[PDB]
Amino acid sequence: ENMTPQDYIGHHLNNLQLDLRTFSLVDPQNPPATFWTINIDSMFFSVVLGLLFLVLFRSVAKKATSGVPGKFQTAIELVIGFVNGSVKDMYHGKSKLIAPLALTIFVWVFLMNLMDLLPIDLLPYIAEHVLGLPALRVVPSADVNVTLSMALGVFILILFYSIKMKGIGGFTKELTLQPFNHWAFIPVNLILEGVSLLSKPVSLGLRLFGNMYAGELIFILIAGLLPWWSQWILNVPWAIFHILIITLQAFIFMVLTIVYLSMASE
Amino acid sequence: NLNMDLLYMAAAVMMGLAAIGAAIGIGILGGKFLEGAARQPDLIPLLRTQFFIVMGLVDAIPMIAVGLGLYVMFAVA
Amino acid sequence: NLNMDLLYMAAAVMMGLAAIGAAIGIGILGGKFLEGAARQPDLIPLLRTQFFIVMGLVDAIPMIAVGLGLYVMFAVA
Amino acid sequence: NLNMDLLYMAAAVMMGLAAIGAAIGIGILGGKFLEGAARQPDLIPLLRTQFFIVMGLVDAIPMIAVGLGLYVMFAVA
Amino acid sequence: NLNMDLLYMAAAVMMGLAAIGAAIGIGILGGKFLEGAARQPDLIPLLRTQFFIVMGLVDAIPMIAVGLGLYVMFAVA
Amino acid sequence: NLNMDLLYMAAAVMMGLAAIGAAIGIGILGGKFLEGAARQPDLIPLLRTQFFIVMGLVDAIPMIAVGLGLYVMFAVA
Amino acid sequence: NLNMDLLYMAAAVMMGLAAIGAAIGIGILGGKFLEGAARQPDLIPLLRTQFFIVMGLVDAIPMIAVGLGLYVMFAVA
Amino acid sequence: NLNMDLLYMAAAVMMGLAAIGAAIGIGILGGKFLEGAARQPDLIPLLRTQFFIVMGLVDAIPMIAVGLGLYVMFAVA
Amino acid sequence: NLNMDLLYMAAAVMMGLAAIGAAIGIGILGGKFLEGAARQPDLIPLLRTQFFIVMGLVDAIPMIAVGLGLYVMFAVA
Amino acid sequence: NLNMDLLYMAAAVMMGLAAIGAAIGIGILGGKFLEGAARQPDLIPLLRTQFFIVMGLVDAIPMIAVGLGLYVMFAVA
Amino acid sequence: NLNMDLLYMAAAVMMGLAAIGAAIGIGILGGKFLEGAARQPDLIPLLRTQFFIVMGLVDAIPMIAVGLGLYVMFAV
Amino acid sequence: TYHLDVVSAEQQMFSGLVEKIQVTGSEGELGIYPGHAPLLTAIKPGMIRIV
């Protein structure tokens, strides 16, 4: 085969975008400049992972008994206990929303990141040849949108909690007075509070996207540049690292969401 | 053309400086927080609150600097 | 071509230096405040109030630097 | 000529400064974490969880520069 | 007339270096001031006077630099 | 054309900064590890595991920078 | 003409380096002085005398640089 | 002609930064090792083993930098 | 012509670096003396004389730099 | 003439960076050695031997940089 | 003539970096020397010897840098 | 030189002027010389040796 590694890298960094208006498959060679072209590859893998999570959790919840626990049920009981313990550590309120939200965030983000461990070309080669799709990339987390949509939803939840539990009066009071509490600093206080408030979810989403993106691109470079006989000696030491990376990043997303919600509410 | 091309370098300089300053300051702050939580383990949720309070102060200037660099590299460029 | 571009370059270097200085100074001040909080947790309401006053002096100069950088970027263009 | 290489140099500046800041800040944090773990070898999970909080806070902002540099390199240049 | 553009950069570098120096110096001084207030909380009004006396010296050169850069930026340019 | 020379310089800067950070942060971390291992010589296998745990976090961004510098040097230039 | 553009930049660099070094040195010295004054009150005048003695030595080369940058700016350019 | 000349500066910056990073990291690690050996002279063979274990991680990136600097200086020239 | 324009810049950068180094080194030397005098005043004159001894060596190279900058600025022009 | 005027700067960068790195690393190592010899005066010959052992490791690369800079300056001209 | 100002600039860079290193490393060393004298006031003559021994190593490269700066400045 | 006392709750073990001593401090072996700054530390079991 004849290919320039630059273009091999180019294809992998492209997405099966499809026009919402005309229902037309975009191609990687020429990107149009229209806003409403959903990037299908990340979203298609992303909801599939959520479906798998929901299916497994229901398939265990539908039978679990307080008797002798099975080997399969034990992993789900352990993850439920871990999430519940983290929530009880960093949340004391009565809101039933917090714990399932954190559980969903943790499991879904872990599932999305796990896709990166797979061989980079397997699913894209399958989609191109067997199906015929112009482009494909299978790690959902590497999408900025998936990260930013989740972060903005968490920010919306933070605003709701500040308005409701913390109070709109208790929100204007904090924004105006704190941290300097004097009217001379109140204009400065508003700017500082707004900047930090918007910094938090942007930090969450862009941290997750940076981790996943900079692992996927490393895998793509390793695949594209090195000869086959030498790839393993640098690919294997990286996947072992990225397992810890994805675990840590899902844990960080869950715990930081918990922290932000608890600080907004209480 | 060179006029817009150099703007990318200007934004690069600005946001790199912002990132180094923020990373080092937050690292020092977190190191002090970890040592404090290691001296008094029962006190961790208070120190963590204080750490968030001061971290909201630290990042504001690096955050706005990075935001303005993003502005210069996207809206301007 | 290169007049506005260099204006943006000057604003970039100015704001980067300001962000570096603010981040480092507030990091040091907050680390020492955290240590003083750790030593005597019940004194935190007073030490935090003094830290806020000192941090205002810390913030005083990077804010005029950032304001002049924003002026250069937006107004002078 | 002036188009591509200046973009490459800008990306290099971004992702050298981000590496400097993130590495130094994470080393600073990990030093205090490892010092705490030697004092209280039992409390290690709690201290490492707090370390994870601070490590995420530190790592958040350099990754902005890292991702934007990758963008500048490949999408732009 | 290219003369104008270089003067803005000359003001920007001066003011950025002044901001870095003054913010780091004031943070270093205030950190020891806060630790001393943590140790002997009754002495705080005396340590505040001493801190102001010392701070009046730290900002000697930085305020001259900031004034001269502001002069260059407006009166000369 | 002359454009090829600047790519080497940009890769040089990026990799040099990446090596500066990857060396200094790892040095600080290892110094703390050795200091903690001197105290409790029986805890070396645990401290050594945690040292690896944090050290993986340290060098990641330097590894990204080094890989991008290798790419720029060989594949692009 | 060409003279003033480079002369203002040279004076700016000189005064900025002076403001960096003087501020950092005075910050460190004042931090140690404040820590000693917090350690042993009622010796504040003696420690202040010694601190002034040292400070007179510290600012010397920074004051020479400040004076020569003023000379360049307001005599040469 | 610049294709030959500029490559020596691109290697000079790499072999300066790699040397600064390796020297600072090895100095800090060796200082901690020396202090630990001074406090606990019996453990010197163990602390030396752990020091040599850790030091091979510090040199990992600076040695890539120095080898690539030699390559850039000699092979491509 | 360009000659004086570049020579003033060379003198400025050299003297600025010399001032930074001398000021920071003298500040550290003075801070250690301040802590040693805070610990026990009965040794103040002895430490103060050794401080003069060491400070004599401190200014060795900075004053060579200052003299050669003065020469460049005033006799080479 | 045109060719030779730039090799002296290639020597200058390598030798300045090598001098800074070697001097600072040797200063850190000597400071720790002096600390250890101040704690236990009787171990001074053993500590001196260990310091001389480590110092050769410290200044290996800086000596390569100084050697190649002298080679450039006095054989490449 | 045209490259002379550049010769002076390179000499100034060398002599600035050499002064930076020779100041900071000797300051770091002298801080520990002062603290060790403040602990062991009798051993001061003993410690001064070791201080001079290591100071001989510290100045080694800054003096090469200063001599080459002087050569570039005045001897070419 | 300094005056060394070695005592216990039950008995005085030794008293006399001493030029230098070797003693195992809490964190490591320690040597004491005349004019030493005030110092406080526990001592681990073992030999203390005196001149």
CSV table of C-alpha atoms in Angstrom, one decimal, chain A residues 78-265:
chain,number,residue,atom,x,y,z
A,78,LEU,CA,-18.7,-3.0,45.3
A,79,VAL,CA,-19.1,-0.2,42.8
A,80,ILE,CA,-22.4,0.9,44.4
A,81,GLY,CA,-20.7,0.9,47.8
A,82,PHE,CA,-17.7,2.8,46.5
A,83,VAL,CA,-19.9,5.5,44.9
A,84,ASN,CA,-22.2,5.7,47.9
A,85,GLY,CA,-19.2,6.0,50.3
A,86,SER,CA,-17.7,8.8,48.2
A,87,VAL,CA,-21.0,10.6,48.2
A,88,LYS,CA,-21.5,10.1,52.0
A,89,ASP,CA,-18.0,11.4,52.5
A,90,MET,CA,-18.5,14.6,50.5
A,91,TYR,CA,-22.3,15.2,50.7
A,92,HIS,CA,-24.7,15.4,53.6
A,93,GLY,CA,-27.9,16.7,52.1
A,94,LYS,CA,-31.2,14.9,51.4
A,95,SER,CA,-31.1,15.3,47.6
A,96,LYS,CA,-31.7,11.9,46.0
A,97,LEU,CA,-30.2,13.3,42.7
A,98,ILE,CA,-26.5,13.4,43.8
A,99,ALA,CA,-25.7,9.7,44.2
A,100,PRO,CA,-27.2,8.3,41.0
A,101,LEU,CA,-25.8,11.2,39.1
A,102,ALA,CA,-22.3,10.5,40.4
A,103,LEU,CA,-22.7,6.8,39.7
A,104,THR,CA,-23.8,7.4,36.1
A,105,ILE,CA,-21.0,9.9,35.6
A,106,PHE,CA,-18.3,7.5,36.9
A,107,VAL,CA,-19.5,4.4,35.1
A,108,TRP,CA,-20.2,6.2,31.8
A,109,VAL,CA,-16.9,8.1,31.8
A,110,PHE,CA,-15.0,4.9,32.6
A,111,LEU,CA,-16.7,3.1,29.8
A,112,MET,CA,-16.0,5.9,27.3
A,113,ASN,CA,-12.3,6.0,28.2
A,114,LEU,CA,-12.0,2.2,28.0
A,115,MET,CA,-12.5,2.3,24.2
A,116,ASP,CA,-9.1,3.9,23.8
A,117,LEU,CA,-7.3,0.6,24.9
A,118,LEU,CA,-8.7,-1.2,21.8
A,119,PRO,CA,-6.5,-1.4,18.7
A,120,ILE,CA,-6.8,1.9,16.9
A,121,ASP,CA,-7.5,0.5,13.4
A,122,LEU,CA,-9.7,-2.4,14.2
A,123,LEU,CA,-13.1,-0.8,14.3
A,124,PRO,CA,-12.2,2.0,11.8
A,125,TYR,CA,-11.0,-0.7,9.3
A,126,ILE,CA,-14.2,-2.7,9.9
A,127,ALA,CA,-16.4,0.4,9.4
A,128,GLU,CA,-14.6,1.5,6.2
A,129,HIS,CA,-14.4,-1.8,4.5
A,130,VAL,CA,-17.4,-3.9,5.6
A,131,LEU,CA,-19.8,-1.0,5.9
A,132,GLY,CA,-18.4,1.8,3.8
A,133,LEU,CA,-18.4,4.7,6.2
A,134,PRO,CA,-16.0,7.5,5.2
A,135,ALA,CA,-14.6,8.0,8.7
A,136,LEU,CA,-14.7,6.6,12.2
A,137,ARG,CA,-13.1,7.1,15.6
A,138,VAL,CA,-14.4,5.0,18.5
A,139,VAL,CA,-13.3,6.7,21.7
A,140,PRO,CA,-16.3,8.9,22.7
A,141,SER,CA,-14.4,10.7,25.4
A,142,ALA,CA,-12.0,12.2,22.9
A,143,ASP,CA,-14.9,14.2,21.7
A,144,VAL,CA,-14.7,17.8,23.1
A,145,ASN,CA,-18.6,18.0,22.8
A,146,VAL,CA,-19.2,14.9,24.9
A,147,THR,CA,-17.0,16.4,27.6
A,148,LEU,CA,-18.4,20.0,27.3
A,149,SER,CA,-22.0,18.8,27.2
A,150,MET,CA,-21.5,16.9,30.5
A,151,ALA,CA,-19.6,19.8,32.1
A,152,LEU,CA,-22.3,22.3,31.1
A,153,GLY,CA,-25.0,20.0,32.4
A,154,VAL,CA,-23.1,19.8,35.7
A,155,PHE,CA,-22.8,23.6,35.6
A,156,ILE,CA,-26.6,23.9,35.1
A,157,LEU,CA,-27.1,21.6,38.1
A,158,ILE,CA,-24.7,23.8,40.1
A,159,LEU,CA,-26.8,26.9,39.2
A,160,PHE,CA,-30.0,25.1,40.1
A,161,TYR,CA,-28.6,24.1,43.5
A,162,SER,CA,-27.3,27.6,44.2
A,163,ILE,CA,-30.7,29.1,43.3
A,164,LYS,CA,-32.7,26.5,45.3
A,165,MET,CA,-30.8,25.1,48.3
A,166,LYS,CA,-28.2,27.9,48.6
A,167,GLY,CA,-30.8,30.5,47.5
A,168,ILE,CA,-30.9,33.3,45.0
A,169,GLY,CA,-30.5,35.8,47.8
A,170,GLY,CA,-27.6,33.8,49.2
A,171,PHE,CA,-26.2,33.8,45.6
A,172,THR,CA,-26.3,37.5,45.0
A,173,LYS,CA,-25.0,38.1,48.5
A,174,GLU,CA,-22.0,35.8,47.9
A,175,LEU,CA,-21.4,37.2,44.4
A,176,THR,CA,-21.5,40.9,45.5
A,177,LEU,CA,-19.9,40.8,49.0
A,178,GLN,CA,-17.5,37.8,49.0
A,179,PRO,CA,-14.5,37.5,49.1
A,180,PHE,CA,-13.7,41.0,50.2
A,181,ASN,CA,-17.2,41.9,51.6
A,182,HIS,CA,-16.7,45.7,51.0
A,183,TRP,CA,-18.7,47.7,48.5
A,184,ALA,CA,-15.4,49.0,46.9
A,185,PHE,CA,-14.5,45.5,46.0
A,186,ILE,CA,-18.1,44.4,45.0
A,187,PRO,CA,-17.5,45.0,41.3
A,188,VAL,CA,-14.2,43.1,41.6
A,189,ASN,CA,-16.0,40.4,43.6
A,190,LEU,CA,-18.6,39.8,40.9
A,191,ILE,CA,-15.8,39.4,38.3
A,192,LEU,CA,-13.8,37.0,40.4
A,193,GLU,CA,-16.8,34.9,41.4
A,194,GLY,CA,-18.0,34.6,37.8
A,195,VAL,CA,-14.5,33.8,36.5
A,196,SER,CA,-14.0,31.0,39.0
A,197,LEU,CA,-17.6,29.7,38.6
A,198,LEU,CA,-17.1,29.4,34.8
A,199,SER,CA,-13.6,28.1,35.3
A,200,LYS,CA,-14.7,25.0,37.3
A,201,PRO,CA,-16.8,23.1,34.6
A,202,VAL,CA,-14.6,24.2,31.8
A,203,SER,CA,-11.7,22.7,33.8
A,204,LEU,CA,-13.6,19.5,34.2
A,205,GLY,CA,-14.5,19.0,30.6
A,206,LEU,CA,-11.3,20.2,29.1
A,207,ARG,CA,-9.2,18.1,31.5
A,208,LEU,CA,-11.1,14.9,30.5
A,209,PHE,CA,-10.9,15.8,26.8
A,210,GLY,CA,-7.2,16.6,27.1
A,211,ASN,CA,-6.4,13.3,28.7
A,212,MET,CA,-8.4,11.2,26.3
A,213,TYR,CA,-7.3,13.1,23.2
A,214,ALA,CA,-3.6,13.0,24.2
A,215,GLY,CA,-3.8,9.3,24.7
A,216,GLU,CA,-5.6,8.6,21.5
A,217,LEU,CA,-3.1,10.7,19.5
A,218,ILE,CA,-0.2,8.9,21.1
A,219,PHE,CA,-1.7,5.6,20.1
A,220,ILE,CA,-2.2,6.9,16.5
A,221,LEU,CA,1.3,8.2,16.3
A,222,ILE,CA,2.8,4.9,17.6
A,223,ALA,CA,0.7,3.0,15.0
A,224,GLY,CA,1.5,5.3,12.1
A,225,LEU,CA,5.2,6.0,12.5
A,226,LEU,CA,7.0,2.9,13.8
A,227,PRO,CA,7.5,-0.4,11.8
A,228,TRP,CA,5.3,-3.3,12.9
A,229,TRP,CA,8.1,-5.3,14.5
A,230,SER,CA,9.0,-2.3,16.8
A,231,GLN,CA,5.6,-1.0,17.7
A,232,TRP,CA,5.0,-3.3,20.7
A,233,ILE,CA,8.0,-2.0,22.8
A,234,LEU,CA,6.4,1.4,23.0
A,235,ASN,CA,2.7,0.6,22.6
A,236,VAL,CA,2.6,-1.8,25.5
A,237,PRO,CA,4.2,0.5,28.1
A,238,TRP,CA,1.7,3.1,27.2
A,239,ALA,CA,-1.6,1.1,27.5
A,240,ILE,CA,-0.6,0.0,31.0
A,241,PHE,CA,-0.2,3.7,31.9
A,242,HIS,CA,-3.4,4.6,30.2
A,243,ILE,CA,-5.4,2.1,32.2
A,244,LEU,CA,-4.4,3.9,35.4
A,245,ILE,CA,-5.0,7.2,33.5
A,246,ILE,CA,-8.6,6.3,32.5
A,247,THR,CA,-9.4,5.0,36.0
A,248,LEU,CA,-8.0,8.1,37.6
A,249,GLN,CA,-9.8,10.4,35.2
A,250,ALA,CA,-13.2,8.9,35.8
A,251,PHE,CA,-12.6,9.0,39.5
A,252,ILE,CA,-11.5,12.7,39.2
A,253,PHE,CA,-14.6,13.6,37.2
A,254,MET,CA,-17.0,11.9,39.7
A,255,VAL,CA,-15.4,13.3,42.8
A,256,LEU,CA,-15.0,16.8,41.4
A,257,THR,CA,-18.6,16.8,40.4
A,258,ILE,CA,-19.5,15.7,43.9
A,259,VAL,CA,-17.3,18.5,45.4
A,260,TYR,CA,-18.8,21.2,43.2
A,261,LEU,CA,-22.4,20.2,43.9
A,262,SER,CA,-21.8,19.9,47.7
A,263,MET,CA,-20.1,23.3,47.8
A,264,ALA,CA,-22.9,24.9,45.8
A,265,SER,CA,-25.7,23.3,47.9
